[PDB]
Enzyme design. Structure first.
Site, mmCIF file in Angstrom:
data_model
loop_
_atom_site.group_PDB
_atom_site.id
_atom_site.type_symbol
_atom_site.label_atom_id
_atom_site.label_comp_id
_atom_site.label_asym_id
_atom_site.label_seq_id
_atom_site.Cartn_x
_atom_site.Cartn_y
_atom_site.Cartn_z
ATOM 1 N N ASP A 130 65.351 -46.677 53.242
ATOM 2 C CA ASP A 130 66.476 -45.748 53.205
ATOM 3 C C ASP A 130 67.664 -46.296 53.984
ATOM 4 C CG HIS B 220 66.135 -45.056 71.009
ATOM 5 N ND1 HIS B 220 66.256 -44.081 70.042
ATOM 6 C CD2 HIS B 220 65.864 -46.208 70.349
ATOM 7 C CE1 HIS B 220 66.066 -44.619 68.850
ATOM 8 N NE2 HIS B 220 65.827 -45.908 69.008
ATOM 9 C CB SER C 190 65.425 -35.834 51.125
#
Ligand SMILES: [Ca+2]
Ligand SMILES: [Ca+2]
Lengths: 926, 926
Positions: free
Chosen positions: B25, B88, B407
């Site tokens: 993706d 992160h 999706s």
């Protein structure tokens, strides 16, 4: 064909033999005269020598000569490269040559009553400023005088001189002309109403006269032209069913075949195809309307052709001069007659080669747009009226029919006064030239007869005809004359009046015997058509005749009380800001006999001096329109600015202007970029109207935004970036004004700033590039948000006040206020954002914080399409996020990838405060 | 909550423990995924070591391990500056950490029916060309296979890839996965109709499916999403008049406090003050419509509402995700439920804490804009349908509501097939991964249940739902399956068909027993709404059930005759260029029982391959309008070009373009001034449409001019001056085409010139900057009037022919002709003129003589208005003369004097031939 009746005057004073007449114009190319023959050499300037000597004794150098008749022709404002045709056949065709006969149909010349006088033709034109054009003019008249003219005809070529302020060398020349008893005569103007011929003045704005001649140029007489109830015209005979000839008037372009029997076929208005069904050999008979002449004549030629006869679609219409379309012989005829041919059994006609003075379809008529005018002190501008061919030309320009054939009216009166002044040289031998000039002027105006508008059953306004139509027979026999109370003027002005007022005039009897007279005063106002003045008279009433006797060699005052109170209510409902009450004080030997004398008077029922000088701001228009600006129906407050290409003729109304400067240009400057002209972006700096704003999602239009109270949201951010930094006054002035000044007042009421003053303001009496635009932008009124000698003013609301004063004597200063918000607070915007690669949505860490409300908040990016830059804008989603596309398509089908670095977040507030931040900046770590 | 019924398949094949699921993706930021846990670390990859080992054995140097789930991750397209949050938290918050739980109402997630499988996350995006994207994608699937995938979910992020021609690398990559029994699954797309969700396809152009995934991809399965007749949803409860509780579905943005009674008040559509009068302290109940959601909510908050409940104005609408407006709790409910609340006496509601599976207001529903598609050979594009939350988002962008929550549908099917294939590992021991995959696909599609559209009493079209809604239960228990006449596919396509045809399919009995079943075929077409397709099905009829027995372990052909001649007259009246005849061949073991198997089929009643590929030229529009262009009512012939600033989204239709070059620029170039954007003139070079012309008296618009025969007046003057030198084809393609080429034929029919070929043409399926514009300008088709040998062709009339061929097999080449005249004759104009300083008119000696009719005959001059050049034009008077002004006024009230040296006579004919002569030149002493 002697409308002004000069025969008796000529019999008494002559025809100008030995006299000199001066004619000052922009050019004489259209001689009109058959290049004017000659005469009977019996007086002065009989040869170059004659000229040279005198011309040298007077200190004159640039004098010429053209033969008899025209004993002079110097060209002032010469230097400028001139090439008429072949230059008189290349150096006067080897010396000795030049001529051009023919004077058909034209009843009057450049002398009218003095055909046996020599002419002094001085060409003067505007070349390098009015100030120099004025000095030439002044010299041009001083030379005429030194050359001995006593009569001077002035014309100012292609106007545009309305209210011009020329040097004192001009007025000086006029005073000098007056001191020598020399008359300066000019035309009143044929396009004298506010707004021009394509419009009408508004009924609530009665100050609508437009004086074409500059005040400084105070001529002896300003003359209006009119069409008599009969004129010398070409004709065409027709046989009626009752079997009889009917000769009718016709105006023709191109010449038909003298005496024939042409056949004619009706064709309606030639707007259709079946209209010219045949026309084969028939002359096309068509009614005016729907389409223009050029086309009617072309369509007629297509078919049968031969020739055309267009007939007016208006009853009392002036004869129209058709255009020359391919040599096509075209003649114009009245409506009446036209309707006569359309029914005549034998569709046949003959063109007579013999011009014949016949009645006119119009009858006694002054163009509705002619002469209107008042002097600064309230006097009517025109002094007298005189006959003219007065024909409407359809080829003067492609915007409107221009009145033609009036140029010979002023010269006619000039000649007549020259002869009358001459008559007085023998009749009153002890008088000085000046005194004879004054007397001749007073008698000419007193004896002139007030013209009557049968159509309205009222006399034409004195504001158009002055003291009346010149009558040489009466002037010459006149042994009495009427003046105003002061015994100086031949016109009366009362200024402001109530419904009840008195008109007092003085009759001067110069005969050795008492004179019995009957007198009355006529009273009238303006006719209105809806919200507009119709430019026509409206009679109210006339007083009944009173008798009075003036003893020999004495003067007596006559007072006529007037009372128009009974008309007040109706008249105020039509003209709420006041209206004129005017007319004539007329005298007669007997009420049943003709007018002996007449003097005009005028008053204003209201306060003329204080009539509003400025049209209200478009912001205030409940409709969105104004006098020169049409609103967009289906678009409330749409008010676009100059846009990418300005049109001087659009957006002419009262408002404030400011500038829009896109963030792209702002940034380019803050950086360096010297060019900025070829930056990779499609927006430019634009001039817009204050209080207007584009939509968040631009639609190429700007709209007025208002506070809850209805006032326009005008705001500036004077921080030098060029985006809405200032406001500037733009005005549509309905009246002339002076000392226009802008000042700014804070909440308390203190004046914190004052602009430089604009000494004179010329009213916007038209919307045309050649005269005056419908509005004017005043740069001296621009306020950059700073105080008097100082710095930027503090944030808050201020009053931008525009002050101006009407020119009328004693007029109070007027002003218009605009509330302007000042605010230099930079918008506070998110310092960070997150971007969803799956969603293509940018989420800002916080919403924008601005002092003034948010104007626009967008994400911009620019991409190239064939080397053509295009800046796109993205508006926020309903939740405040922005969706960023991954690409943009080219018109040629190519895909242009877009990256985070292409996007810039831009926030702008209502005052133009703006901040732009690269999206990469927002995304980066912090 | 198991709409696909995967329970029975899982308790027979497991839940993916030990298997690997790959996901390719453009991003994963939105991917909720209940990552972290695995409850059985006995997966294919235990610890980073097992992973690093595996990729070392397959030459993979990139990639990283993360969680026991998601054993692999990698970004195949880094560089270019792409930032997320803050890494992160500075290197995965201390290396090895993370947490982002937040999923509800969703019974599905990545992995599909295999929650225990590990994931391989491949991030791929378009970065530096689709070529690099392709390789990166091919490599990603290759790494997925080698890392032991078995199932690969492919997502192309934000497409704009429709019909993109990717390298032969991608295909090899797929053929490899196919050989390894690895299924690649992708979504069918939610915006698949020609023109986009904002429009509707025209009824006379039946080729309206838009396939978003590139052809060189061909997935194992293309999955359509749909809303089941019941979904898990949060709820709200009210006390009805019968005193009982009524629980209803609700979709909330932000949050209401659970188990707390809220009072509510009706506010109509919230489109007018007072609507929110009794809202303070209550939830505002507002009906959808007129204004956007954001405004209804903002107004509610301003009125003091503590939240809002917006109810649908559509009866079978998808729930709508409302925007977050200042954190206002906002919930969306169905129309029926909203009306129930509006009419309920006790206006009190409670929001429940626990979601619940409840009937949907939409019922079983496929978005009317989703899936539509056919492959090049005529097969329906979608293969199967699967459930999704299918919610309309009001915040995806600011132009249209985007279908969301779809999706997870494709990944669901991927997981089901992964399990079915695993199931086949046991039963059917000798099959090969490749054969197991093929059987699984066949069974899954055959087993899928044809969805029924209750609103239209018809099955949803196979072009949307493929072979039906996946049913893992029937799939897992299946011992039979149907395929096309062969055994290649599970879909049938008949291409062109008449009213009578037959559908033949093969039933495969893998059972050891004879199978008795009943079968029939359903027949349907498209529902039409006026001139447009409604994007809805129109049922025609279903055949009577027939009997058939299939022996054990064998295949048997079944043929169903179809006769729809009864409907042709009506259908042809609505869809005149043909229409589809499609449906399903259904099988049951009992006509009253449920569907056991069904295979879709499709035919086109007409000639599909030869359907028109190009929209007719705008010139041929009786209306002046086209699919992407609305004409101007009041001026059907107005057709402006690019103007001062082009708009990519405007004027998108089929036509020819050319360019307008003002004489000022032609002159500046012919003289030699470098840099054209410096010249003292306001006009610029503009792109316009051939056959269009400005008015003599320019009004800022261009209009189509036509010959008497009605054809556009297209003409060029190929003389290199840039003014109407060429014609270029612009087309709005309704179908994809190939080999676009332009050619010019002379009167004889001979080809005198041919352009370069444009190999591929992508249809203009939308008018959007991010996908495709409504038309495309084809520069290779530009003809500069030269023949095949660089020689300018002789003046005359030519045929500009544009040829192109549909991509359909067998399709004939189509073409569109445009008549273009070529004429390089320079205008012949007066060489002399005379100017009257008195009349102000300029009289020309003769002409203008031109080969083509005169376009414009004008006199130009340019003056400055604040350092801003402005070119003014004067049209001729009705007799051909021109009146020249003496001055021009600036917006600031200044006078700009004009002399002869300022005027230029400009003549231009219909082909652009032009001449410009200084007025002084014409005066040059003659
Ligand atoms: Ca500013
Ligand atoms: Ca050309």
């Amino acid at each position: 064909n002697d409308p002004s009746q000069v025969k008796t005057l000529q019999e008494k004073a002559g025809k100008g033999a030995g006299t000199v007449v001066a004619v000052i114009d922009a050019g004489f190319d259209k001689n009109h005269e058959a290049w004017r023959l000659t005469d009977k050499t019996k007086a002065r300037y009989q040869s170059k020598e004659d000229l040279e000597k005198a011309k040298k004794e007077h200190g004159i150098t640039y004098g010429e000569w053209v033969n008899d008749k025209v004993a002079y022709y110097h060209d002032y404002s010469k230097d400028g490269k001139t090439a008429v045709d072949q230059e008189h056949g290349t150096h006067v065709s080897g010396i000795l040559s030049g001529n051009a006969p023919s004077e058909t149909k034209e009843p009057y010349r450049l002398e009218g009553a003095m055909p046996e006088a020599q002419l002094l033709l001085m060409r003067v034109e505007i070349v390098n400023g009015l100030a120099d054009y004025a000095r030439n003019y002044a010299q041009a008249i001083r030379d005429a005088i030194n050359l001995g003219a006593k009569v001077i005809n002035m014309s100012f070529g292609n106007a545009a001189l309305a209210y011009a302020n020329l040097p004192d060398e001009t007025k000086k020349a006029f005073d000098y002309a007056k001191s020598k008893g020399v008359s300066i005569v000019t035309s009143a103007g044929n396009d004298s109403s506010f707004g021009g011929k394509t419009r009408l003045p508004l009924a609530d704005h009665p100050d609508y006269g437009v004086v074409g001649t500059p005040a400084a140029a105070d001529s002896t007489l300003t003359v209006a032209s009119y069409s008599p109830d009969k004129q010398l015209t070409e004709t065409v005979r027709v046989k009626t069913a009752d079997q009889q000839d009917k000769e009718m008037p016709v105006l023709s372009t191109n010449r038909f075949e003298p005496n024939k029997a042409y056949d004619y076929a009706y064709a309606n208005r030639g707007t259709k195809e079946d209209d010219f069904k045949d026309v084969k050999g028939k002359i096309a008979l068509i009614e005016r309307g729907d389409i223009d002449f050029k086309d009617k004549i072309a369509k007629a030629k297509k078919a049968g052709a031969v020739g055309v006869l267009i007939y007016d679609n208006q009853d009392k219409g002036f004869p129209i001069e058709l255009p020359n379309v391919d040599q096509m012989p075209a003649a114009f005829i009245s409506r009446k007659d036209g309707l006569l041919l359309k029914d005549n059994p034998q569709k046949t006609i003959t063109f007579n080669a013999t011009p014949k003075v016949l009645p006119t379809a119009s009858g006694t008529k002054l163009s509705r747009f002619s002469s209107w005018g008042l002097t600064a002190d309230g006097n009517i501008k025109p002094d007298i009226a005189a006959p003219g061919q007065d024909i409407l030309s359809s080829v003067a320009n492609n915007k409107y029919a221009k009145l033609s054939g009036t140029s010979m009216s002023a010269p006619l009166v000039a000649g007549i006064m020259g002869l009358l002044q001459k008559q007085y040289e023998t009749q009153y031998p002890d008088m000085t030239p000046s005194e004879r000039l004054d007397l001749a002027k007073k008698v000419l105006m007193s004896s002139a007869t007030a013209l009557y508008d049968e159509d309205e059953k009222a006399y034409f306004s004195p504001r158009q005809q002055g003291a009346g139509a010149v009558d040489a027979k009466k002037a010459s026999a006149a042994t009495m004359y009427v003046t105003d109370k002061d015994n100086t003027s031949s016109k009366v002005h009362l200024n402001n009046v109530s419904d009840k007022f008195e008109v007092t005039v003085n009759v001067h009897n110069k005969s050795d015997k008492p004179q019995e007279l009957y007198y009355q005063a006529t009273v009238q106002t303006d006719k209105v058509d809806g919200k507009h003045f119709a430019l026509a008279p409206k009679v109210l009433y006339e007083t009944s005749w009173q008798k009075i006797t003036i003893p020999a060699n004495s003067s007596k005052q006559v007072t006529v009380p007037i009372d128009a109170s009974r008309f007040s209510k109706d008249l105020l409902a039509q003209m709420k800001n006041g209206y004129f009450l005017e007319g004539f004080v007329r005298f007669k030997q007997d009420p049943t006999k003709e007018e002996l004398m007449s003097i005009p008077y005028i008053g204003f029922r209201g306060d003329f001096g204080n009539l509003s000088a400025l049209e209200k701001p478009i912001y205030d228009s409940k409709d969105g329109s104004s006098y020169y600006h049409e609103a967009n129906s289906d678009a409330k407050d749409q008010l676009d600015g100059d846009g990418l290409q300005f049109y001087a003729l659009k957006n002419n109304f009262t408002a404030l202007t400011t500038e829009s400067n896109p963030w792209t240009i702002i940034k380019a400057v803050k950086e360096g970029v010297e060019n900025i002209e070829d930056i990779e972006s499609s927006e430019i700096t634009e001039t817009i109207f204050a209080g207007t704003f584009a939509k968040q999602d631009d639609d190429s239009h700007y709209y007025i935004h208002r506070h809850a109270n209805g006032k326009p949201y005008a705001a500036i951010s004077p921080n030098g970036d060029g985006n809405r930094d200032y406001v500037q006054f733009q005005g549509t002035f309905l009246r002339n004004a002076k000392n226009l000044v802008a000042e700014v007042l804070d909440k308390e009421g203190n004046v914190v700033w004052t602009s430089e003053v604009t000494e004179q303001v010329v009213k916007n009496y038209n919307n045309d590039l050649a005269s005056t635009l419908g509005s004017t932008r005043f740069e001296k009124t621009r306020w950059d948000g700073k105080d008097k000698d100082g710095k930027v003013v503090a944030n808050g609301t201020y009053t931008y006040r525009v002050r101006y004063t009407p020119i009328s004597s004693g007029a109070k200063e007027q002003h218009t206020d605009f509330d302007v918000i000042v605010d230099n607070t930079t918008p506070e915007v998110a310092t960070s954002a997150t971007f969803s690669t799956e969603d293509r949505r940018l989420t800002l860490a916080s919403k924008p914080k601005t002092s003034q409300p948010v104007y626009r908040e967008r994400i911009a990016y620019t991409y190239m399409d064939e080397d053509l830059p295009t800046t796109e804008y993205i508006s926020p989603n309903e939740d405040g996020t922005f969706t960023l596309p991954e690409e943009a398509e080219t018109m040629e089908g190519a895909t242009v990838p877009l990256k985070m670095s292409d996007f810039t977040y831009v926030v702008e507030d209502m005052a133009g405060n703006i901040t732009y931040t690269p999206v990469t900046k927002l995304l980066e770590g912090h």
